[PDB]
Design a protein around this ligand. Sequence first.
Ligand SMILES: [K+]
Ligand SMILES: [K+]
Ligand SMILES: [K+]
Ligand SMILES: [K+]
Ligand SMILES: [K+]
Ligand SMILES: [K+]
Ligand SMILES: [K+]
Ligand SMILES: [K+]
Ligand SMILES: [K+]
Ligand SMILES: [K+]
Ligand SMILES: [K+]
Ligand SMILES: [K+]
Ligand SMILES: [K+]
Ligand SMILES: [K+]
Ligand SMILES: [K+]
Ligand SMILES: [K+]
Ligand SMILES: [K+]
Ligand SMILES: [K+]
Ligand SMILES: [K+]
Ligand SMILES: [K+]
Ligand SMILES: [K+]
Ligand SMILES: [K+]
Ligand SMILES: [K+]
Ligand SMILES: [K+]
Ligand SMILES: [K+]
Ligand SMILES: [K+]
Ligand SMILES: [K+]
Ligand SMILES: [K+]
Ligand SMILES: [K+]
Ligand SMILES: [K+]
Ligand SMILES: [K+]
Ligand SMILES: [K+]
Ligand SMILES: [K+]
Ligand SMILES: [K+]
Ligand SMILES: [K+]
Ligand SMILES: [K+]
Ligand SMILES: [K+]
Ligand SMILES: [K+]
Ligand SMILES: [K+]
Ligand SMILES: [K+]
Ligand SMILES: [K+]
Ligand SMILES: [K+]
Ligand SMILES: [K+]
Ligand SMILES: [K+]
Ligand SMILES: [K+]
Ligand SMILES: [Mg+2]
Ligand SMILES: [Mg+2]
Ligand SMILES: [Mg+2]
Ligand SMILES: [Mg+2]
Ligand SMILES: [Mg+2]
Ligand SMILES: [Mg+2]
Ligand SMILES: [Mg+2]
Ligand SMILES: [Mg+2]
Ligand SMILES: [Mg+2]
Ligand SMILES: [Mg+2]
Ligand SMILES: [Mg+2]
Ligand SMILES: [Mg+2]
Ligand SMILES: [Mg+2]
Ligand SMILES: [Mg+2]
Ligand SMILES: [Mg+2]
Ligand SMILES: [Mg+2]
Ligand SMILES: [Mg+2]
Ligand SMILES: [Mg+2]
Ligand SMILES: [Mg+2]
Ligand SMILES: [Mg+2]
Ligand SMILES: [Mg+2]
Ligand SMILES: [Mg+2]
Ligand SMILES: [Mg+2]
Ligand SMILES: [Mg+2]
Ligand SMILES: [Mg+2]
Ligand SMILES: [Mg+2]
Ligand SMILES: [Mg+2]
Ligand SMILES: [Mg+2]
Ligand SMILES: [Mg+2]
Ligand SMILES: [Mg+2]
Ligand SMILES: [Mg+2]
Ligand SMILES: [Mg+2]
Ligand SMILES: [Mg+2]
Ligand SMILES: [Mg+2]
Ligand SMILES: [Mg+2]
Ligand SMILES: [Mg+2]
Ligand SMILES: [Mg+2]
Ligand SMILES: [Mg+2]
Ligand SMILES: [Mg+2]
Ligand SMILES: [Mg+2]
Ligand SMILES: [Mg+2]
Ligand SMILES: [Mg+2]
Ligand SMILES: [Zn+2]
Ligand SMILES: [Zn+2]
Lengths: 76, 113, 91, 202, 24, 23
Amino acid sequence: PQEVSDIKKFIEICRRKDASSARIKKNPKTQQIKFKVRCQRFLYTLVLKDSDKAEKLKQSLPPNLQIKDVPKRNKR
Amino acid sequence: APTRVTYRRRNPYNTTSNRTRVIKTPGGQLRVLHIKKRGTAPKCGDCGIKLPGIPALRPREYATISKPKKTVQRAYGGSRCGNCVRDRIIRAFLIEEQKIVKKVLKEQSQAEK
Amino acid sequence: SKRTKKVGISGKYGTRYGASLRKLVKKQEVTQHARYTCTFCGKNSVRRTAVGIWSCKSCKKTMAGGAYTVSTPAAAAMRSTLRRLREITEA
Amino acid sequence: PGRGAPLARVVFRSPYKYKQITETFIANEGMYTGQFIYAGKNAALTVGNILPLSSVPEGTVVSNVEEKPGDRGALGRTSGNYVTVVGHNPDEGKTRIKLPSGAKKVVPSSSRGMIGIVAGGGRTDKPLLKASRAKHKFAVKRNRWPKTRGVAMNPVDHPHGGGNHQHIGKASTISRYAAQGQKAGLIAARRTGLLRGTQKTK
Amino acid sequence: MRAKWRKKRTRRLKRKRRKVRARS
Amino acid sequence: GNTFKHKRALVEHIHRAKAEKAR
RNA sequence: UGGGGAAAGGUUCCAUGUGAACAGCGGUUGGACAUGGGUUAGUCGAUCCUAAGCCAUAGGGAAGUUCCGUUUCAAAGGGGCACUCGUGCCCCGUGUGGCGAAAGGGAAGCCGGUUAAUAUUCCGGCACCUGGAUGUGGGUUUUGCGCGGCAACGCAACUGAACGCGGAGACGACGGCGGGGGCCCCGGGCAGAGUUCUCUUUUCUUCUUAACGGUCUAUCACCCUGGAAACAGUUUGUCUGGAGAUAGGGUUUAAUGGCCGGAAGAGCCCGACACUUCUGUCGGGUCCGGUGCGCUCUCGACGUCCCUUGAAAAUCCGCGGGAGGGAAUAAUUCUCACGCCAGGUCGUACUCAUAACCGCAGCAGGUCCCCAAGGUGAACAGCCUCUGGUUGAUAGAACAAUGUAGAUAAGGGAAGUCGGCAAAAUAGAUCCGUAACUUCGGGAAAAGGAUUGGCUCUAAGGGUUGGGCACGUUGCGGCGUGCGGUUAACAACCAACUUAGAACUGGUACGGACAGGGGGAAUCUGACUGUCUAAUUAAAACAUAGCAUU
RNA sequence: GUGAAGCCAGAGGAAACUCUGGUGGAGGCUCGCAGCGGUUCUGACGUGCAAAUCGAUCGUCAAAUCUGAGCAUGGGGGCGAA
Ligand SMILES: [K+]
Ligand SMILES: [K+]
Ligand SMILES: [K+]
Ligand SMILES: [K+]
Ligand SMILES: [K+]
Ligand SMILES: [K+]
Ligand SMILES: [K+]
Ligand SMILES: [K+]
Ligand SMILES: [K+]
Ligand SMILES: [K+]
Ligand SMILES: [K+]
Ligand SMILES: [K+]
Ligand SMILES: [K+]
Ligand SMILES: [K+]
Ligand SMILES: [K+]
Ligand SMILES: [K+]
Ligand SMILES: [K+]
Ligand SMILES: [K+]
Ligand SMILES: [K+]
Ligand SMILES: [K+]
Ligand SMILES: [K+]
Ligand SMILES: [K+]
Ligand SMILES: [K+]
Ligand SMILES: [K+]
Ligand SMILES: [K+]
Ligand SMILES: [K+]
Ligand SMILES: [K+]
Ligand SMILES: [K+]
Ligand SMILES: [K+]
Ligand SMILES: [K+]
Ligand SMILES: [K+]
Ligand SMILES: [K+]
Ligand SMILES: [K+]
Ligand SMILES: [K+]
Ligand SMILES: [K+]
Ligand SMILES: [K+]
Ligand SMILES: [K+]
Ligand SMILES: [K+]
Ligand SMILES: [K+]
Ligand SMILES: [K+]
Ligand SMILES: [K+]
Ligand SMILES: [K+]
Ligand SMILES: [K+]
Ligand SMILES: [K+]
Ligand SMILES: [K+]
Ligand SMILES: [Mg+2]
Ligand SMILES: [Mg+2]
Ligand SMILES: [Mg+2]
Ligand SMILES: [Mg+2]
Ligand SMILES: [Mg+2]
Ligand SMILES: [Mg+2]
Ligand SMILES: [Mg+2]
Ligand SMILES: [Mg+2]
Ligand SMILES: [Mg+2]
Ligand SMILES: [Mg+2]
Ligand SMILES: [Mg+2]
Ligand SMILES: [Mg+2]
Ligand SMILES: [Mg+2]
Ligand SMILES: [Mg+2]
Ligand SMILES: [Mg+2]
Ligand SMILES: [Mg+2]
Ligand SMILES: [Mg+2]
Ligand SMILES: [Mg+2]
Ligand SMILES: [Mg+2]
Ligand SMILES: [Mg+2]
Ligand SMILES: [Mg+2]
Ligand SMILES: [Mg+2]
Ligand SMILES: [Mg+2]
Ligand SMILES: [Mg+2]
Ligand SMILES: [Mg+2]
Ligand SMILES: [Mg+2]
Ligand SMILES: [Mg+2]
Ligand SMILES: [Mg+2]
Ligand SMILES: [Mg+2]
Ligand SMILES: [Mg+2]
Ligand SMILES: [Mg+2]
Ligand SMILES: [Mg+2]
Ligand SMILES: [Mg+2]
Ligand SMILES: [Mg+2]
Ligand SMILES: [Mg+2]
Ligand SMILES: [Mg+2]
Ligand SMILES: [Mg+2]
Ligand SMILES: [Mg+2]
Ligand SMILES: [Mg+2]
Ligand SMILES: [Mg+2]
Ligand SMILES: [Mg+2]
Ligand SMILES: [Mg+2]
Ligand SMILES: [Zn+2]
Ligand SMILES: [Zn+2]
């Protein structure tokens, strides 16, 4: 797994043919939002502190991608 | 907490290839991890000291890392240390110069007749 | 603080092998464990590596010598005789 | 291991091919790493050089002397030993030499030798002093240590055999032309006993 | 580098040259 | 050498040394 | 007497059932008897390489089965290019077989879950290696194959044939010292449990973080400036320096170190409701410090020893050289990023031993390794305890002689006996004291004496942080400085142990169990340490260094 | 447990040299646990647990110490610190 620094590169990663899916994980105790995209070789993570760009970023993603919300206590 | 461990492979003997170290797992257990042997630094071809700027790996591992990481930008980049390269340049120049003066002196001062 | 009267380096042998034999081995142990001044660099760092090999810790040169001394009297005499034989006849 | 007399590794250059060749000589006292040495008929009279005996004056000392020109060295190759040139004979091409045992020999003048004495000094001067020290010496040579006395075996084992006392029972000097299994003792002995005077033979 | 490594690179060049000919 | 027994002995020796050096 | 393996065995493994026989008593139980089921790999091994060694080929012996010989007295090979289409061309040449290691060398996988019985092999997530094809992005080149730094060298790339040089693979035993991971130990906090006549802010348990990556650092060593005697730097252990030290500034080999991705969504601990079953559902928590001649593994710099100097091959890389090839609109055999495809064959259950191996057997014998908690204590000694594991060896009743094993005796103290055989006596630690002889190293723990509990105190042995003015900048500034000075060494905080002294106290006892040398004066004989008659003899016998002879 | 070379400091003497306190950690040295071995009881047992075992008492214990796998030597032959 690898980390992505800025937002512009993370958007360009999600516009790739081998991008299978994406998900959103939020940690309320430490007030973080994590965006993860599943590619052929690696899983890319982007970490955000605020919450006024998360929905802005969410609508900027390509519409054909599948985005989930990572429920607590995922079933086996 | 003071739990005992076992090997994870069929070899039960403490040889120079049965290297292990202890870890603790996200499941809260003490286990064993099997590790390779340490790399060795390449040496200078004249005096035999460790070359600076070059990693220490097992021999097969050098086939995958990029070229600029395996050499330094100078004549005799690998395998010579730089002090030795300085000696070679000076010695080559001085000996070549004495060759000319010995030739001229021998030809002129002794074959003038 | 002298801590030994006469046995010296051969005090590791206790009360074994006989007095005369301990003296004879003492003569050879003292000279093979000493330091000698290098002929090429000048420093006082030359020790025995193997039975006939002597090496300098500073300038990294090794030389062929005697069993327990850096040079032998027979070799020293021969070098002068060879020097005289070649020189005073050809020069 | 197994030898006194350290060895020297010397690198030469090929006259007919683009490469280099590494040799292994016996080391004379006084040689050092980084030293130039010379070999041939026109080499100089310096320690460590190799030249034919026809190019040396009488009284010089050499080591690793060929018995015949080309066999690469047979005589005087042990620590602290050498051979001495005695005389020449240019019309027929022979040289007289003296060997470490004290014997005299005649050799063709094209044989080669190395100027100097064999390094290794007076190794045999200090006592071994311990059984373990002798054991370490032979453990890298051959299986010959320890050694049981024949007079302490049974008659089936050795000629010195048994008896109600340890003794030999017959003369211990054995003829030169005996059978294998009989030669145990002093073979073809010209004399016996403590050597009092000088030894006439040279 | 090893000879098998170098053989692969020149093999690719030969294929590319015949294919670019086939293209032309 | 076996001169100073502990830290206090070394400090006292320093003070006397500087006192005589003063003169 | 726990948890796993190598050799050896071969179904002994799991479930259901059972008359006899077997388990030297019984048996509803079984490693027994009957019927069914169970072993999943590109990453762990074999397969590849060579060692000691074994065997083909050229040749020579032998009536012959066959013996020798392993590079030799041999015409002994391999590399490239088109093919109209295999047929044809052109280079180099000293050399030229195989088998042999499940502990040597060696490309690549970790965590969680799952079964009656398999798992680093199955399921989920997240990676890596080799081989083969190949396209985008980026890089280089308008005068052809990259820039930067005084330098050590750095950067995502950044042509390189024949022939040659070098490095890695690749190596001994022992000693003290330093860094890192795991275990042990101490203090605080949140949950749960045990005790509670009395005491105890108490006693016990959980509080975890993998492979693979990114980023900042970490001994040795190397570079630049400069020029040392009033010599300096410096290790527990005396090495280093005009062949260039101290000092100031830099470069670099080496994470099992800090932070981030993986990753809390996992695992673990509590609580509240559902639920015949099928089924579950929902809330909280999962922190912060210290200590050490501690135990175990690993790394580093030093040192000692040798008439002892402690493997080879496969495989991978760099360099010297400059053959061939290439753009001005495209070219690029760019070791850079991402992307496409594949990885065959055999083993894998279980035991490894007072019942799965070998001893005629379910025999007190024998058989190679890894992991290693608390207390006392010098301690892997003996003795008691936790996790884990057993409660299995025919039983019931009685207490005669004679036994085997364990012990105590008044007074005398070897009078017993071939002979002090057996037993008894001594024993830790601290402080005194110690002869003849001697190869001067020893004898020596020679011999002979004194002390030792409990409680209340006193003294000594360490670490970190602070130091006064005068200018200028900076959200009490932190510093660029010009200085002055050596607090007659002060203040605050932090932390284990080791040693020495005093008073008081008791049925004079205190290494209170365990653990734990009897000593002296002489004779014979072998110098010493070592070795042998497996199953009646361990010795004065053998070996040994030294000496002499051939 | 004992404490060899090398090293630091102080003291004595005209010199050559001598004395004292530390540091260091050598030896086919020494007490002793595991392993390896087998002195005595002439102990147990002696139709034995056992065709060589059991108990107590003993020897050595950092080097001529103990040990696995692979390989070699074959019967008038091997191997033998005998
Ligand atoms: K580098
Ligand atoms: K010969
Ligand atoms: K032998
Ligand atoms: K003998
Ligand atoms: K006798
Ligand atoms: K005799
Ligand atoms: K495989
Ligand atoms: K695959
Ligand atoms: K196989
Ligand atoms: K294979
Ligand atoms: K071989
Ligand atoms: K034949
Ligand atoms: K192998
Ligand atoms: K299965
Ligand atoms: K491009
Ligand atoms: K570039
Ligand atoms: K090896
Ligand atoms: K350590
Ligand atoms: K540690
Ligand atoms: K630790
Ligand atoms: K502890
Ligand atoms: K790994
Ligand atoms: K100086
Ligand atoms: K020390
Ligand atoms: K160990
Ligand atoms: K070129
Ligand atoms: K298995
Ligand atoms: K298994
Ligand atoms: K096994
Ligand atoms: K303990
Ligand atoms: K204990
Ligand atoms: K009774
Ligand atoms: K009775
Ligand atoms: K008596
Ligand atoms: K009697
Ligand atoms: K006592
Ligand atoms: K007498
Ligand atoms: K003995
Ligand atoms: K015996
Ligand atoms: K004995
Ligand atoms: K014997
Ligand atoms: K004698
Ligand atoms: K010691
Ligand atoms: K023992
Ligand atoms: K026979
Ligand atoms: Mg006999
Ligand atoms: Mg006979
Ligand atoms: Mg006879
Ligand atoms: Mg006889
Ligand atoms: Mg069963
Ligand atoms: Mg059953
Ligand atoms: Mg029965
Ligand atoms: Mg029955
Ligand atoms: Mg039954
Ligand atoms: Mg059955
Ligand atoms: Mg493997
Ligand atoms: Mg054959
Ligand atoms: Mg034939
Ligand atoms: Mg093979
Ligand atoms: Mg292996
Ligand atoms: Mg690939
Ligand atoms: Mg090149
Ligand atoms: Mg982490
Ligand atoms: Mg890191
Ligand atoms: Mg410095
Ligand atoms: Mg994290
Ligand atoms: Mg949780
Ligand atoms: Mg199992
Ligand atoms: Mg077992
Ligand atoms: Mg048994
Ligand atoms: Mg059996
Ligand atoms: Mg204690
Ligand atoms: Mg009974
Ligand atoms: Mg009795
Ligand atoms: Mg009595
Ligand atoms: Mg009495
Ligand atoms: Mg009495
Ligand atoms: Mg007795
Ligand atoms: Mg006493
Ligand atoms: Mg005595
Ligand atoms: Mg004896
Ligand atoms: Mg016997
Ligand atoms: Mg006996
Ligand atoms: Mg001993
Ligand atoms: Mg002993
Ligand atoms: Mg008996
Ligand atoms: Mg009986
Ligand atoms: Zn160099
Ligand atoms: Zn030197």
